[PDB]
Write a protein that binds this ligand. Structure first.
Ligand SMILES: [Ca+2]
Ligand SMILES: [Ca+2]
Ligand SMILES: [Ca+2]
Ligand SMILES: [Ca+2]
Ligand SMILES: [Ca+2]
Ligand SMILES: [Ca+2]
Lengths: 647, 647
């Protein structure tokens, strides 16, 4: 047991909670565990692809109501308002499930090799993983034997995907703590709805608005709930306004208080409670991080001198460079990290000074040209003029001028979109020239800045990709002037025109005051993914429930469907017949635009009032809790960055 | 010229920028100005009532399109979908205008008495006031002579009302300061809209969604703006979804990015700019206050010793107690404030120590019973038992039990809302007893805590007034069992139930966590008044413009009206025919619920595309600027209070 290997393992554990068990580093036969751990970590791309394949299977499964015998077979894609995604047959679904299940089974039960026996079977996460895998295997076996109330696999495989990502696991734990305070503010919100309905039920008792809308307290409470979202504001109290113009005062007060006071109060409480959960998690994670780093320091210094020498600190680096979960470190970066690590400036790292290792590792990002091989070409009299001009401030001025000319060429080309293909070639030739100029621009930039220096920053790598993607398509259209099924097609021409448009957005980066706002938007999406992924997983669960409950009520032969608001508004294509169909239907309810049409219509098709619990719970869980959390993220991101420049 | 009088005037100026001119305190004949200033300030209630009456005249004026000769006379209130507020005849309008104009003219030109001659005519605010008064007088004279393109008096009197209140003027100044940054963010929003519209127009060129919705670039931009409002989300791209389910991805991306990113960025920018404006205004006002207080202190101390004695300070107190714009101060409050002001504890107030006078004045609010006159009654064994019981914690428990019994009685009474008046008498008697026992509670509370100590708090006064208002109504209903036109009416019974339900709301204060939120809302309402008044004035201006432009297009005989979205949705009662009608029509656009129905319909009635400039500018000015500001205020208040409790 080499102490440096254990120190590297402890550093890997300190970077994030994922790693080797703590109690096996000093245990005998540790290398046999490290080897299997490295082998397991070499296949993380395969594991992630398998998990995404399991997640994306719900989109391609035949709906459960098709497993029965409807009067027309559901291959009639127009009768049920289905569309555009194929269904997997029995053989295809069976083989896909078998392959994915085998890979998942290998992934789940492999940690037992480097975790021993008792440690694997005493972890709650491993226990729930094994339980989910066993449930999925039993479901697959039952399905194979049949070829049953309902198919439970869709829910299970979504759960497996959620717990397979560390960020998705963390979000659910945080939401668990919020559940106490969130339920508290829902009771206050519920009391406001309950009493406001009581006032409106007795006020409009014998009036015209109580004989058609507020027929009973349940009807009143139902209508006052929708009014709280301002989805039917003028519609609901037309009869009250037609019989008395003073009745509008009550509804004006209710909407104003409901929207500005109550709705904003929920957002403030949700964000405040969630922000408290970060403090508990971050402090706990950081406290664990420093404990692991401190323990690693003790292993390295067996002499108890208190500090590590230069070579000993270096020897740690090549031991921790075998891990793929740690930032890449070069050979010359070894001194760079040690130079930056030293805070007391004594050629030695201290115990409390060593606790800033993980932050130090991924902070260097610096440092030399391959065009310096021949000094008779690069160092020329005319070369300096080119070198001066490319680095001159007018270089951007010239490129901006070219972009403006390109902008003029694009807008005039889009104007002649109804003309035939006879006059499109002259503009194609002009666009052909514009493609190579930008390639010439980026190639010239490589000649001056170098190759490796040109590739260091991540933003330029995106510019490298988009420049090459658009030029190969542009030149492919020109080198093939005869008729083709891939270059003269209407779809290909449209894609070409869009590509040049997304090139023109670069002009918007010239405005510094606008460029800052775009940069904030770009840097926010990576940090918003775990919360956006949770919303996607919640939609997946709700989509599976919607298909199983509201399966085939929207047909071309239903009689009660054409009397509902769904048919009158021509929303028949937004149903819960498919998984893709229900995935975009839940997006329409996500934005709360005409959202009560589906809630009203599916209540009539099911014929029961219990069906509205599907939509009420979706609004409460997703709109009020998850979307309000995402909204609060965008505000806090802008508020901190905006105030930063004035400081 | 008594120096204490000038010191009191300077303190009045320090409290707020409204007061006597600075350069007349040392000028000769100062008392002749102070007397007129006090006389002017004694009539502030009359001035405020006159200003509010002038503002409220727009609601009672006959619309200008009625001044012409429509085919039916507009006394037929149903033909034009008018309703419920009377029109002032020529004589009534003339006399009301004369009275208001006379009072306003007296108010405007009275300051010239205590401001001299040259000072009055060199102030920009006074010049604007005089110009507005002259314009209003000219309009009144022209109207009298006639009995003309249009009447300008509505806008002028709205402006007069706006500039007659300091808070509205401050809000306007801050908005003028913000205008540049608001335009800066609007330009980026417009660029985003234009780019998205270009992409959508080109990409759906020859598709079914481009032959019915995106017919041209202007129509595409219009529909993309409405979609950014998310008022027609599923409707706009139904043809695209019907021809290709993958087309929904573009619209999903547009809606998500637009709404979240752009809306929250605009809100953040507006809030940041307004906070900067608040910082500037507060800094300037505080600097002016300190300068005025320093000048007053310099005036008081003519001996240049550096500190003021006690008697001189008390003399300042009863010299400044003559102003009605300053907080009330009693006799012992003189010594109380003198003791509280002393920070160095030396029986003397210092130069910088005196600058904390305005804050100290309205901070005492303390300090004794009138029931102590007879010690043979108040001091008794049973009296002691009652005093112990009322102040005991079980007093609240018993009152809560009584209120719960009242809740049961009220709910069972409301259950039998369809029954006749024969069985309502027992419940009327029960609620009669409830009202009297509540009055007994209030009287006993007065008896135990005293009279003045009971009247010190404000919520206690509110409880007193509401209890008396409900009990007088209950007893008036009970003592008249025979048929009456005021006590057996259904409206009276409904009012009684509504009054009782608020008493039933008193129980909501028992929950501490809900009581904190309610108190936060209650203390938030006063601080939001200037912004709500600014929104109200903007709504008044827009209503006047809408009545002037969209006057009588909504009739019962129009042919192009029944083909519009206004008639199909049965929104015909929400038009711009009246001032009351337009005032509630603008509220429907305020909440952005089905808001494009009016924008679509009036474009067809006017027959021009310029009419949408009325609705777009309303959305930009009101929804994106003022309502966002109110929302930001609510969020920041809730956040600060919340974070205050965990601290
Ligand atoms: Ca790790
Ligand atoms: Ca050492
Ligand atoms: Ca050191
Ligand atoms: Ca004053
Ligand atoms: Ca003195
Ligand atoms: Ca002192």
């Amino acid at each position: 047991g080499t102490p440096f290997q254990k120190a590297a393992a402890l550093v890997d554990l300190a970077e994030d909670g994922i790693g080797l068990p703590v109690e096996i580093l000093d245990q005998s036969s540790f290398g046999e565990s490290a080897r299997y751990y490295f082998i397991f970590t070499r296949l993380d791309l395969i594991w992630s692809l398998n998990y995404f394949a399991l997640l994306f299977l719900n989109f391609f499964e035949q709906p459960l109501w098709c497993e029965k015998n409807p009067k027309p077979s559901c291959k009639d894609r127009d009768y049920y308002y289905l569309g555009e995604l194929p269904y997997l047959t029995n053989a295809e679904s069976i083989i896909y499930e078998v392959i994915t299940l085998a890979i998942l089974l290998v992934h789940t039960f492999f940690p037992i090799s480097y975790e021993g026996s008792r440690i694997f079977w005493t972890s709650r996460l491993n226990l729930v993983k094994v339980a989910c895998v066993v449930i999925l295997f039993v479901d697959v076996l039952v399905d194979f034997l049949y070829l049953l109330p309902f198919r439970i696999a869709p829910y299970v495989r979504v759960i497996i995907f959620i717990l397979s990502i560390r960020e998705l696991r963390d979000t659910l734990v945080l939401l668990s703590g919020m559940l106490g305070t969130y339920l508290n503010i829902l009771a206050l919100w519920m009391l406001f709805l309950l009493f406001a309905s009581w006032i409106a039920f007795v006020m409009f008792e014998a009036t015209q608005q109580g004989l058609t809308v507020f027929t009973s307290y349940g009807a009143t409470l139902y209508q006052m709930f929708i009014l709280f979202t301002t989805s039917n504001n003028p519609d609901v109290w037309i009869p009250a306004y037609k019989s008395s113009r003073w009745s509008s005062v009550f509804f004006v007060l209710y909407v104003l208080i409901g929207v500005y006071f109550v709705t904003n109060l929920i957002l403030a409480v949700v964000y405040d409670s969630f922000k408290e959960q970060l403090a508990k998690q971050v402090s706990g994670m950081d406290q664990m991080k420093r404990r692991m780093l401190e323990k690693a320091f003790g292993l390295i210094d067996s002499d108890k001198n208190g500090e590590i020498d230069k070579n000993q600190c270096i020897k740690l680096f090549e031991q921790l460079t075998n891990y793929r979960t740690l930032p890449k470190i070069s050979k010359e970066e070894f001194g760079l990290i040690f130079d930056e690590l030293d805070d007391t400036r004594d050629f030695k790292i201290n115990k409390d000074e060593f606790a800033d290792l993980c932050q130090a590792i991924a902070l260097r990002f610096q440092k030399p040209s391959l065009f310096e091989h021949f000094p008779q070409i690069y160092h020329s009299a005319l070369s300096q003029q080119l070198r001066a001009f490319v680095r001159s401030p007018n270089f951007g001025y010239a490129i901006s001028f070219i972009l403006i000319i390109n902008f003029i060429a694009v807008v005039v080309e889009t104007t002649l979109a109804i003309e035939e293909s006879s006059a499109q070639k002259p503009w194609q030739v002009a666009e052909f020239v514009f493609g190579w100029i930008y390639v010439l621009e980026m190639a010239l930039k490589i000649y001056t800045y170098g190759f490796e220096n040109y590739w260091r920053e991540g933003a330029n790598r995106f510019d490298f990709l988009v420049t090459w993607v658009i030029v190969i398509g542009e030149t492919a259209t020109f080198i093939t002037p005869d008729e083709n099924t891939f270059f003269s097609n209407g779809a290909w021409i449209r894609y070409l025109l869009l590509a040049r448009m997304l090139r023109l957005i670069r002009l918007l980066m010239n405005v510094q005051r606008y460029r800052a706002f775009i940069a904030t938007f770009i840097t926010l999406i990576p940090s918003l993914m775990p919360y956006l992924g949770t919303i996607f997983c919640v939609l997946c669960i709700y989509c599976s429930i919607g298909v199983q409950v509201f399966g085939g009520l929207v047909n071309a032969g239903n009689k009660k469907l054409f009397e509902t608001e769904l048919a009158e508004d021509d929303y028949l294509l937004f149903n819960f017949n498919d998984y893709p169909n229900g995935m975009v239907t839940l997006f329409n309810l996500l934005v709360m635009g005409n959202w009560q049409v589906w809630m009203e219509s599916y209540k009539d098709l099911t014929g029961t009032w219990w069906s509205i619990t599907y939509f009420v719970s979706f609004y409460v869980i997703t709109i009020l809790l998850l979307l309000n959390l995402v909204v609060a993220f965008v505000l806090e991101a802008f508020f901190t960055e905006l105030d930063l420049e004035e400081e």
